[PDB]
Design a binder for this molecule. Structure first.
Ligand SMILES: [Mg+2]
Ligand SMILES: [Mg+2]
Ligand SMILES: [Zn+2]
Ligand SMILES: [Zn+2]
Ligand SMILES: [Zn+2]
Ligand SMILES: [Zn+2]
Lengths: 162, 162
DNA sequence: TTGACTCTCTTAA
DNA sequence: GAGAGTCA
DNA sequence: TTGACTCTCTTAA
DNA sequence: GAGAGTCA
């Protein structure tokens, strides 16, 4: 809601509920042939999810609170960032999973950045393989690697140069 | 169905027409602080585009040829790959710009790969900065870099561990 | 047979 | 990656 | 008030 | 990143 006190109250209640989600250990590639360990706080697969939480899509949830008799609702991962600018360089700020685990609501696994920055973490070599993200990755992106390209650049005639 | 010879004829007419597009010299980052040069063959901004070409979206075009009274149409960047497999690992193959220049139709700037592989090239450090793509990038991805993350992982209480 | 428009769709964040 | 409505 | 569902939308490849 | 329709 409008007041900083009301916003802090929302964040604290969210943290308390999410803090009771099951903690699931995930071992992850860091890059550079190294492995690390993350502790994700995972929202349940089916109702009930926790006080204030409801599922609006296969892997989408919302957090809802009644303030001054009004219902206020947010994307379930956006709540840690309610005091931050909601845009940057004219681009919408999004909740971005450093653990690449959508059910996880651990705020120590979330950052707040453009959708492009968010997406790009999928291909990052990781914190021990050359990550240059200023807010550092927690793991190598799941899509990092050589790819599976079917056909490379080619021409039949002699009309083109690189 | 079009024969292999007929498909080759389509590819040849496409190359003939694209080869007459304006050729634009672009200086590009290669990674590792080096600069290189790419020569893009750019479809015009407005009609007419060239024999067989028409715009179906702001940055989408199609190539059309009529053979034995039947109209055939393809995405304008897909024609170089008409003799290639059209899927891999259960994923549809897409035209992927190594020059990241959508108007460019230079087949030496295109590869044929999954949409995930395609997208991921946007963040690649480049052929002189650590690219691991098996079909190597021609340049550093336009979105490579530290990013512009607004807020990092954080908690107000002590409910969480990383 | 061809050009120049029109429309909607896919994917995974 | 999002917002919002329908019911109980 | 709170829970459990429903729907469509945004972005940039 | 795509496929397909209309009109002359
Ligand atoms: Mg993400
Ligand atoms: Mg691309
Ligand atoms: Zn997590
Ligand atoms: Zn990173
Ligand atoms: Zn090009
Ligand atoms: Zn690359």
């Amino acid at each position: 809601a409008l007041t900083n006190a009301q916003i802090l109250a929302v964040i604290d209640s969210w943290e308390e509920t999410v803090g009771q989600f099951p903690v699931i250990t995930h071992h992850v590639p860091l890059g550079g042939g190294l492995q690390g360990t993350l502790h994700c706080y995972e929202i349940p697969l089916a109702a009930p999810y926790g006080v204030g939480f409801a599922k609006n899509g296969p892997t989408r949830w919302q957090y809802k609170r009644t303030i001054n008799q009004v219902v206020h609702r947010w994307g379930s991962h956006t709540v840690p960032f309610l005091l931050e600018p909601d845009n940057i360089n004219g681009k919408t700020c999004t909740a971005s999973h450093l653990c690449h685990n959508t059910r996880c609501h651990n705020p120590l696994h979330l950052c707040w950045e453009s959708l492009d920055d968010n997406k790009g973490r999928n291909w990052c070599p990781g914190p021990n393989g050359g990550c240059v993200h200023a807010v550092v990755c927690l793991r190598q992106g799941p899509l990092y690697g050589p790819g599976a390209t079917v056909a490379g650049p080619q021409q039949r005639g002699s009309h083109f140069v690189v």
